[PDB]
Amino acid sequence: NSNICEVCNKWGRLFCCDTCPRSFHEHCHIPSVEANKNPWSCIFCRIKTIQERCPESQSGHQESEVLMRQMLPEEQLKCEFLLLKVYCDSKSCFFASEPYYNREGSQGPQKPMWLNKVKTSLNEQMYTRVEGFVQDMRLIFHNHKEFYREDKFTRLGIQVQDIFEKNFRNIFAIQETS
Ligand SMILES: [Zn+2]
Ligand SMILES: [Zn+2]
Ligand SMILES: [Zn+2]
Numbered sequence: 001n002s003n004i005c006e007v008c009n010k011w012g013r014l015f016c017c018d019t020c021p022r023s024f025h026e027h028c029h030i031p032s033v034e035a036n037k038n039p040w041s042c043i044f045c046r047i048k049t050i051q052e053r054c055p056e057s058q059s060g061h062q063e064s065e066v067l068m069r070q071m072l073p074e075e076q077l078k079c080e081f082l083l084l085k086v087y088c089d090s091k092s093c094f095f096a097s098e099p100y101y102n103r104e105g106s107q108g109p110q111k112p113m114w115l116n117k118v119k120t121s122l123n124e125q126m127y128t129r130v131e132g133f134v135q136d137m138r139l140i141f142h143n144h145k146e147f148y149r150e151d152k153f154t155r156l157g158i159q160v161q162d163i164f165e166k167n168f169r170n171i172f173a174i175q176e177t178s
Contacts, residue, residue: 006042007087017042030084030119043081047171050074060175067131078171079133080122085167086115086137091160095140101147109143130172137164 001016007028014023018039026033034040041049051057069075086092096115101108118136127133141164144157168174 006044007084009090015040017045019045028087030080030087031123043077043084046077047081050077058173061173063172063174066172066174067129067134069130071125071127071129071132075130076122076125079127079130082164082167082171083115083118083122083133083137085171086160086164089160089163091156091163094156095144095160099143103147106147106149109147111139111143113139113143115140134168 001014001021002023003014004011004023005014005025005028006022007024010025012025015026015029015033016023019041022042022044024033024042029043031043071079087096092115098114098117099112101112113136118133118140121127121136122133138161141157141161145154148154148157169176
């Protein structure tokens, strides 16, 4: 197994995957690493199993159909994995915890949003469709772009949104376009 957390790239108290060489801090894995279960298989492994069981699940899909999907166990898992792929980027630090807004010439967003809030909402089964989760994720970056205006710090929202969108297209097998 790896000697660093797959998500944050630090050592510490790591739980090791049985079916692949990845390791995780308890609360870095999503969902949080399960109490018992021997063997244990990480989220990467669980996603790969879905694909192997149904190879056609990789054929291209329309985003509008994906978003309307109910949050059954397989879609729950895909959203968890997509959230995890965002936390894997170190620039997710800026979007993880609850933001506050006091900048001359800007007003805060009407509906603040942050990664840990989305994480709690997924854990508590608050989303009934994929659209709920995607809307909140995109709201994080939209709020940031609007608040920071012409400051160069706006680029951090563009960068992390690009990680989100690439991973959304990969995990949910969105049909490739020009
Ligand atoms: Zn970690
Ligand atoms: Zn694994
Ligand atoms: Zn199948």
